Ligand binder design. Structure first.
Ligand code: SF4
Ligand code: SF4
Lengths: 349, 351
């Protein structure tokens, strides 16, 4: 249903971002990075919950000294989060880091940003351009007066086309608007002018329930419009909750999922079976399937197949039988023992 | 920034829905209707949490005789949910109920529906047209094959224009989709083809956090596209939480709120003051303001005022002073005792 934004594909370690690739779920470590064992324990929990790339803060000397061990033992690509010293970007990259994220706007002189980018090109490390009100250049503040959506977007564009000029192509940008509406607009202006992958999220979303709502609204809207190649929910909470939240939002729009998802039809006046009965049977035999598949349990046979185009696999149920279908095309007719064969086909998938 | 859909105004009791009106927060009661004490106690709790219209389910005969007492002392306009028997619709309207909701596609034959509608015009009671896959007619089901977004939308349009034919205007519609994406598309198709008020919400959102997330996505999208004149969040949780969720969704897009909202600037390289300090001062002095205003505490002076156009009121702070502003216009320069004058203006905003 969503018309995805065309985007060039990039790479952070083993993970594809943009274009053809699924939208990636990201998170940030909340532990002190210099504490190797605590951070790796949190990364492992993040991996367990489906976090695909992890961002690691590196504010001090001791965090740089921890980075090598973290990358070697991380089941995930690691992004080094840099803020003030261009040298930390260089030192982080030498430590084996798969990605750096910088605010090119205040990291230093433009010519130093070029060197960071040229070093990243030599080591095959991805870059994230972060742009926000605090990184907005003096020249654009004068043009717009204040950090407007357009001011933030033009900044992102400006840097993006500098990266292209410098011959560097392996980057994604991130635009943090002050609220949901400014965040949407700022990214929307950028999205429509370029094919550069986008990191999306709401920075200071809030606490617990309220933060979760604001995140769902913000990320959901962008996602709806086919915008976002990577996602992070930013909650002042356990980073696993942040990962779980991101997956629920994506699941809402049928873009990603964790484990098996069993969906029943609406239903309608075409219904041919007792759907609640077969659904219950499906839930029981498919309990303990750890494969990100949308499974469709449909009330009729013929029209159900068209209806469940986007489902990976499902059963189009008739009075004494069902049709097993796969990616919108029917495979075979099976008796009221269609479920074991549906399970059999998923183990084969 | 929000492109609000042009809608005609309707009335449910004394509450205005659509057109010029703010988006109405609605909720359904969870207790049995025939229990009169439990329902009115929950209604009071919902009103205190900001709920503007209450929906009351009526599946049996005892629940109908309960309605009379409920509508007399309820602070909210009450709406009866007519499910199985269309007989309940006539009986509910005689009880003095402000609104009804029916699924006319399966509530019976068209003749009876027409009489339900004509009785609603004489009493002055609003009708909500409920359309979902289950209420879809054999006619359209054969046109589209299955209950697609455009199948759902056409049914809503068809019933809408049948109400027009009967000379009835005081109605709104809701369209339930299979998932968020279908719900959005079906409501979008309807929204562009008519000026009829829409009730929006996700019916089977889920339990707890999962339900909250799914609702926020579904409602957030439609709200962003300027669609929805009344909202209900549907959770298996407490109805009060639904109201709390609805207000937070609307708050994130700056459409509705409960109580004061104090917002600081981003900030940026123009910053003229220690903002966290002045923000904490505002939080302290403004604690005790119940009016749903948006108060902006900005880091600089000149360019801050334009930045905070949409805010009801705020301070644009400099070294030893600040500009007090409302809706993007400067009003008076105040010394670093800029705060007592800000509250003094908000007190005066209320009178
Ligand atoms: S699968 Fe068949 S019975 Fe179920 S909603 Fe679709 S058309 Fe109706
Ligand atoms: S109010 Fe001033 S300091 Fe604050 S974000 Fe706007 S321009 Fe920057």
């Amino acid at each position: 249903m969503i018309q995805k934004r065309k985007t060039r594909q990039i790479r952070v370690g083993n993970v594809k971002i943009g274009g053809d690739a699924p939208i990636v779920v990201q998170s940030m470590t909340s532990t002190k990075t210099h504490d190797v064992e605590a951070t790796l324990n949190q990364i492992k929990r993040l991996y367990e919950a489906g976090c695909e790339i992890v961002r690691v803060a590196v504010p001090h000397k001791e965090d740089v000294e921890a980075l090598e061990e973290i990358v070697k033992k991380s089941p995930m690509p690691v992004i080094a989060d840099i803020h003030f010293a261009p040298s930390y970007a260089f030192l982080s990259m030498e430590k084996g880091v798969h990605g750096i994220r910088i605010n090119p706007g205040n990291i230093g002189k433009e010519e130093i940003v070029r060197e960071i980018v040229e070093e990243a090109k030599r080591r095959g490390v991805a870059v994230r351009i972060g742009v926000n009100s605090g990184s907005l250049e003096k020249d654009l503040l004068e043009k717009y007066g204040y950090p407007s959506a357009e001011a933030l977007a033009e900044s992102a564009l400006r840097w993006s086309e500098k990266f292209e000029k410098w011959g560097f192509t392996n980057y994604k940008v991130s635009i943090k608007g002050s609220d949901v509406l400014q965040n949407v607009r700022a990214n929307l202006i950028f999205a429509e002018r370029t094919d550069v992958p986008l990191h999306i999220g709401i920075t200071e979303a809030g606490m617990g329930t309220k933060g979760i709502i604001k995140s769902s609204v913000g990320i959901g809207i962008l996602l709806y419009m086919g915008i976002g190649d990577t996602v992070r929910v930013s909650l002042t909470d356990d980073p696993v909750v942040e990962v779980e939240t991101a997956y629920e939002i994506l699941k809402s729009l049928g873009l990603r999922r964790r484990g098996v998802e069993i969906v029943a039809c609406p239903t309608c006046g075409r219904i041919e079976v007792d759907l609640p009965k077969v659904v219950k049977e499906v839930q029981e035999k498919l309990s303990g399937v750890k494969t990100p598949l949308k499974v469709a349990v449909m009330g009729c046979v013929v029209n159900a197949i068209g209806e469940a185009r986007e489902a990976d696999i499902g059963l189009a149920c008739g009075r004494g039988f069902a049709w097993l279908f796969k990616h919108g095309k029917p495979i075979k007719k099976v008796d009221e023992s269609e479920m074991v064969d549906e399970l059999l086909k998923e183990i084969q998938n």
